[PDB]
Write a protein that binds this DNA or RNA. Structure first.
Ligand SMILES: [K+]
Ligand SMILES: [K+]
Ligand SMILES: [K+]
Ligand SMILES: [K+]
Ligand SMILES: [Mg+2]
Ligand SMILES: [Mg+2]
Ligand SMILES: [Mg+2]
Ligand SMILES: [Mg+2]
Ligand SMILES: [Mg+2]
Ligand SMILES: [Mg+2]
Ligand SMILES: [Mg+2]
Ligand SMILES: [Mg+2]
Ligand SMILES: [Mg+2]
Ligand SMILES: [Mg+2]
Ligand SMILES: [Mg+2]
Ligand SMILES: [Mg+2]
Ligand SMILES: [Mg+2]
Ligand SMILES: [Mg+2]
Ligand SMILES: [Mg+2]
Ligand SMILES: [Mg+2]
Ligand SMILES: [Mg+2]
Ligand SMILES: [Mg+2]
Ligand SMILES: [Mg+2]
Ligand SMILES: [Mg+2]
Ligand SMILES: [Mg+2]
Ligand SMILES: [Mg+2]
Ligand SMILES: [Mg+2]
Ligand SMILES: [Mg+2]
Ligand SMILES: [Mg+2]
Ligand SMILES: [Mg+2]
Ligand SMILES: [Mg+2]
Ligand SMILES: [Mg+2]
Ligand SMILES: [Mg+2]
Ligand SMILES: [Mg+2]
Ligand SMILES: [Mg+2]
Ligand SMILES: [Mg+2]
Ligand SMILES: [Mg+2]
Ligand SMILES: [Mg+2]
Ligand SMILES: [Mg+2]
Ligand SMILES: [Mg+2]
Ligand SMILES: [Mg+2]
Ligand SMILES: [Mg+2]
Ligand SMILES: [Mg+2]
Ligand SMILES: [Mg+2]
Ligand SMILES: [Mg+2]
Ligand SMILES: [Mg+2]
Ligand SMILES: [Mg+2]
Ligand SMILES: [Mg+2]
Ligand SMILES: [Mg+2]
Ligand SMILES: [Mg+2]
Ligand SMILES: [Mg+2]
Ligand SMILES: [Mg+2]
Ligand SMILES: [Mg+2]
Ligand SMILES: [Mg+2]
Ligand SMILES: [Mg+2]
Ligand SMILES: [Mg+2]
Ligand SMILES: [Mg+2]
Ligand SMILES: [Mg+2]
Ligand SMILES: [Mg+2]
Ligand SMILES: [Mg+2]
Ligand SMILES: [Mg+2]
Ligand SMILES: [Mg+2]
Lengths: 134, 131
RNA sequence: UACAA
RNA sequence: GGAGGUGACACAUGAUAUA
RNA sequence: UCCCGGGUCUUGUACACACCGCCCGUCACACCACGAGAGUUUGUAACACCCGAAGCCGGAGUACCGGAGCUAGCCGUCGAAGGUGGGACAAAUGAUUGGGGUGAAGUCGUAACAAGGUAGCCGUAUCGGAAGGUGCGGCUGGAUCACCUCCU
RNA sequence: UGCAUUAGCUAGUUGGUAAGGUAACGGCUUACCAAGGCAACGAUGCAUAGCCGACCUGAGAGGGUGAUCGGCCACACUGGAACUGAGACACGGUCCAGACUCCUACGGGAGGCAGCAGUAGGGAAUCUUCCGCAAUGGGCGAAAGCCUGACGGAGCAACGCCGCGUGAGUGAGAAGGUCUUCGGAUCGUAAAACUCUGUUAUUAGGGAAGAACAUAUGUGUAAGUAACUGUGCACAUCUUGACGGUACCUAAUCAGAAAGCCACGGCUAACUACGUGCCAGCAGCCGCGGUAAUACGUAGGUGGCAAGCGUUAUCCGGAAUUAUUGGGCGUAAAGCGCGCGUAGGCGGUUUUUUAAGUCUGAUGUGAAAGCCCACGGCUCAACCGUGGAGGGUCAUUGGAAACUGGAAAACUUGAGUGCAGAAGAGGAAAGUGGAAUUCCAUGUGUAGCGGUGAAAUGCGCAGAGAUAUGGAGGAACACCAGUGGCGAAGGCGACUUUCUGGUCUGUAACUGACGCUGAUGUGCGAAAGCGUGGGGAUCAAACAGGAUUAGAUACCCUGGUAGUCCACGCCGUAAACGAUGAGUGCUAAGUGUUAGGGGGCCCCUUAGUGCUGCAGCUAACGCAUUAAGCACUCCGCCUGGGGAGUACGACCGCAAGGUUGAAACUCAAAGGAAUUGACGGGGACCCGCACAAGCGGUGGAGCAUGUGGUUUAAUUCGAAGCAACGCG
RNA sequence: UAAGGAACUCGGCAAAAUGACCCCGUAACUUCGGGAGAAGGGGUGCUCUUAGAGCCGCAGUGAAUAGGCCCAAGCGACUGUUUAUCAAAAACACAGGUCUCUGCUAAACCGUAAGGUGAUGUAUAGGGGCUGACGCCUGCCCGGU
């Protein structure tokens, strides 16, 4: 555009959007209002664990339905081989969407709160909440 | 209508230079006369003649080409514009092509080059870059 | 080929 | 030779990735 | 000329897993978000009115010379909070309801892509299970074959 | 700082007078008078936010943040006041009102951690209910001193940064693990073995600085005194350490206590084996896994880091992906359908003048800390300190005068006017005419007409269709007719008259920059559609019937209503297209055509309208003096696809709808141009027992044989459209 | 008429409440007229000064007279008309729409006729049928009558 057009109507950058919107909101119970805080993880309670089929891929991918501490419902993936989760489990939820699973944008942290570490894991244990053997 | 007679002059040179014309005529003005003489003095063009007439005068320019018909003028660029005027200080005078080209500056001591503007410690309106 | 029917 | 204007019976379908 | 198949050149192509291609929409299924919705709940703020604290303004008692002064008290204007009222706005939720996205190809056809088998597309109107059809005007971002202007 | 999908706001409001009031000016308050004040340069409203030095990022221009340290402001459970005071409308004061909590013997009373700790709660998450006033600072005091959760220290936490360790030297291929083309290879000089060290660690011995003082006591001196005491100044003596027996130093003893985390297909440094078999799982992207996985899990090996290493969240960068620096709009997203025109932006030549912009010095200021450079102290380094530099669109002041702006004066090229010619389907209104269609009548005249791929519906013996004449009526104007003409665009085509718009050529009378663009605005705007009223030939949505078809709500046929036509209103949209905004100038040629002009049918020249084609441009296709080239000015528009031109709001509309116009969510594409193939119910040519022209067979019978299916103890296995089945 | 306030009843029937004037203020929806007196609130006495200052009562339009209001649904557009004497309505009418007849000695109607109405009108007129403001609209069937 012309300089005069830019003076009349300046440039405007596109607004960036967050990939984990449920983590960036808090809840004040006393005032019954939503805040904006940018948390790295959120506590939550498992409403419904289960499995889901992928979008070329084929498997039974384990996940849980979680009500986060800010009263938001999300689908969180359970990484690793075997888990100890069920209804009413207290879990820590972090960011990171799992491709091939539509509607699952978060991960459950292994080895935090009620979720156990992966059993028998020996490589990359810190990603799966497993203590060092022996 | 015509808004920048100086940019029209720089473009007339650019278009004539592109097709390797020997000479070109354009209507005259005081600043166009002084711009043309600096191009002569700096060795970018060959000669400038002033043709008087009833309207505003005529400037005849003679272009320069080296051996193997290589163009002495490589490019011209209007810097200060009617839509956005560009001024500079002596301490921030731009060098054109790392000194191998020139900048034409209108200062309170007249229209001069950038190398001379720093010598005289004057700034002013940056008219054009020639390289 | 592994599938689906 | 190349363009632009002008005018001029019936027949359905075939899963996913990988090719 | 026609059925099957093949060769050369050209032309269109949204095909390249190469027409046994690609592909559209309704209907049926699952999840998700969003709109509408008789209503219900909450919050802000102004406005008007009423009441109106402390305070602001006005109008019996106790160093100076019984008096002056002073204090207490009483009255009205202004005064926060509160109450009353009707509206503005905002957020939540509501039988039901609408369309959309995604997933899977279940179903009905085959609308587009080749002249896609009625060239397609745009606006508009109307009709129809659906893709869509038809009318009117427009465009070429239309294939094949004609008769003319132009250029080479 | 956002939002115009917030456009009206204000009535002590704006000004005046007077009085009151204040430290002070003032609508600060009141009374009276006047009707002002603010706003598209964004008022007002809503939402968000303490602001700055600084901090993070970035080459920079920018973008992002305000925890810690410093400056300023505001607040102290919520709201309203005032008192004292130099100062408060006062965190650990008062008064009042409210919410809440606590004591009560029910009359009554009490409280405010957003001080330091600490508790509960919320949360992914953030510490001791520590020591001391020794230092610095503050209050009070003559002083001694007292007070000081300021502060100085200690405690907890890898939260960050910096530093040092977890050993060093020599040591030829041991065992054990893993792989193996069972030769070997590799872990690996790695281990052990031999010596060496003690940073650290443990035990013991020593042990700073941080401390300056004040008071008091002496002398000396200054002022003052009549003199002294005292006071100021100087020197000398005295006491005082929370940390803390800390830092540090010295001696002894021992390699003994002190390495983990992620990764290894590509991006991207580093590969093998086994297990698993589209499962389990992995994944930032490409994607990996469906029986030989360097991508899953484990193991060996390797790589990268290391007291850390990874993951998540958030910000800047990469991102020229909002492009001032530094992008675009023919076909990829993007030129408003097109005029007229307001604000604004921009604007031809010259002279004089000015000095707002611009340039150039001076002065002041831009605190300290920080960043950067230099130097000094910490064993180094972090860190600390000192001296510089930098950072303003800052202000004030002195100069310069080219450019932009202001003033004045000239100019004629731009733009208008005049004059002289010319062309035109430019527009509005009213008239006249010829062909044809339909209908009607009449005369002749008889068996079909019409229609399709084939038909049928339909019309016809009551006389059709055909033919001839006449009439009615509506609509449209053959030939001319041409990448011809006119118009801003939409559009405009028989002829005549009337009214009227614009353009082009020549001339150089005239005016003297009067120009360009154009947000908002205001108008025009195909067709369909809508309202009122007319008209109604043809054609024809809907609709009916007849066909076709598996079906045919279609294409084809026979009819047919709205509509198509007129007037007056409305609607305001189109592939409203050259998919190319307007203005101005400059940049090879060739060749048609329309309207002119000049000169000798040709040459030159204006303005349109076409084709071809350089330079240049382009992703290519292509564009190319009618640019998509080279430049300057102004406007409009774009920022991945879908959702979606949808929703909500608003405005317009009789309605249909139009204009303005998101987000959630979702995907890694969507897309442009061109290329090689293939394919087409595209074209051209050509060929084959492919068809056609013929002759003889199979499919029907019985049997032989192969196959399938059933059977069976087994009916062995392979072959499965042509190209399996008298096949191996 | 204590306390209560529709618990009455088929049903708030009846009654109560509202009520004047003056000033503030007023929603959905709308055919832009309305809705509207929407709703909801303030003031009224007397004396004195020239809007203030006072005075009195429980109470000041001190009596009497003078709208109750709101939300939502059916029907009918509306004003009007009706069963004199058990029905006032959703029924009739209506403006508007459509169909049909009628070329004037019109059709239609009264009358045996004469004579009349239609109309001293003439298709923008007259009679009859159906529908019933306005907005959006009004599909299929002509075999039978
Ligand atoms: K102290
Ligand atoms: K072909
Ligand atoms: K009638
Ligand atoms: K009949
Ligand atoms: Mg089709
Ligand atoms: Mg088609
Ligand atoms: Mg149809
Ligand atoms: Mg057109
Ligand atoms: Mg705040
Ligand atoms: Mg950059
Ligand atoms: Mg005081
Ligand atoms: Mg205090
Ligand atoms: Mg406190
Ligand atoms: Mg505390
Ligand atoms: Mg907690
Ligand atoms: Mg002290
Ligand atoms: Mg104390
Ligand atoms: Mg940690
Ligand atoms: Mg590598
Ligand atoms: Mg892994
Ligand atoms: Mg394997
Ligand atoms: Mg990998
Ligand atoms: Mg692995
Ligand atoms: Mg380190
Ligand atoms: Mg970034
Ligand atoms: Mg970036
Ligand atoms: Mg771009
Ligand atoms: Mg452009
Ligand atoms: Mg396109
Ligand atoms: Mg486009
Ligand atoms: Mg255009
Ligand atoms: Mg358009
Ligand atoms: Mg250091
Ligand atoms: Mg003339
Ligand atoms: Mg003309
Ligand atoms: Mg203009
Ligand atoms: Mg406009
Ligand atoms: Mg029309
Ligand atoms: Mg038809
Ligand atoms: Mg009409
Ligand atoms: Mg019209
Ligand atoms: Mg466009
Ligand atoms: Mg242009
Ligand atoms: Mg141009
Ligand atoms: Mg060309
Ligand atoms: Mg031309
Ligand atoms: Mg044959
Ligand atoms: Mg086999
Ligand atoms: Mg045989
Ligand atoms: Mg009673
Ligand atoms: Mg009572
Ligand atoms: Mg009551
Ligand atoms: Mg009851
Ligand atoms: Mg009862
Ligand atoms: Mg009653
Ligand atoms: Mg009354
Ligand atoms: Mg009625
Ligand atoms: Mg009535
Ligand atoms: Mg009666
Ligand atoms: Mg009655
Ligand atoms: Mg009726
Ligand atoms: Mg019949």
């Amino acid at each position: 555009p012309t300089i005069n057009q830019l003076v009349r109507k300046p440039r405007q950058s596109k607004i960036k959007k967050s990939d984990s919107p449920a983590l960036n909101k808090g809840f004040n119970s006393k005032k019954k209002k939503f805040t904006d805080l940018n948390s790295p993880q959120k506590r939550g309670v498992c409403t419904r664990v289960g499995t889901m089929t992928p979008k070329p891929n084929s498997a039974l991918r384990k996940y849980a339905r979680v009500r986060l501490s800010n009263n938001i419902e999300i689908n969180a993936y359970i990484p690793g081989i075997g888990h100890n989760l069920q209804e009413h489990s207290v879990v820590l939820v972090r960011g990171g969407r799992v491709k091939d699973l539509p509607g699952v944008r978060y991960h459950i942290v292994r080895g935090a709160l009620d979720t156990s570490g992966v059993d028998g894991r020996r490589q990359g244990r810190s990603l799966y909440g497993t203590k060092k053997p022996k | 209508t015509m808004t920048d007679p100086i940019a029209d002059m720089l473009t007339r040179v650019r278009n004539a230079n592109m097709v390797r014309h020997e000479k070109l005529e354009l209507p005259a003005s005081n600043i166009k006369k002084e711009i043309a003489e600096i191009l002569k003095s700096e060795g970018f063009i060959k000669n400038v003649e002033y043709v008087e007439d009833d309207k505003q005068g005529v400037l005849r320019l003679f272009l320069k080409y080296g051996q193997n018909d290589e163009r002495v003028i490589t490019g011209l660029k209007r810097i200060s514009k009617p839509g956005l005027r560009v001024y500079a200080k002596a301490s921030e005078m731009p060098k054109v092509l790392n000194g191998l080209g020139i900048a034409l500056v209108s200062t309170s001591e007249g229209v001069i080059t950038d190398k001379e503007a720093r010598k005289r410690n004057v700034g002013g309106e940056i008219i054009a870059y020639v390289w």
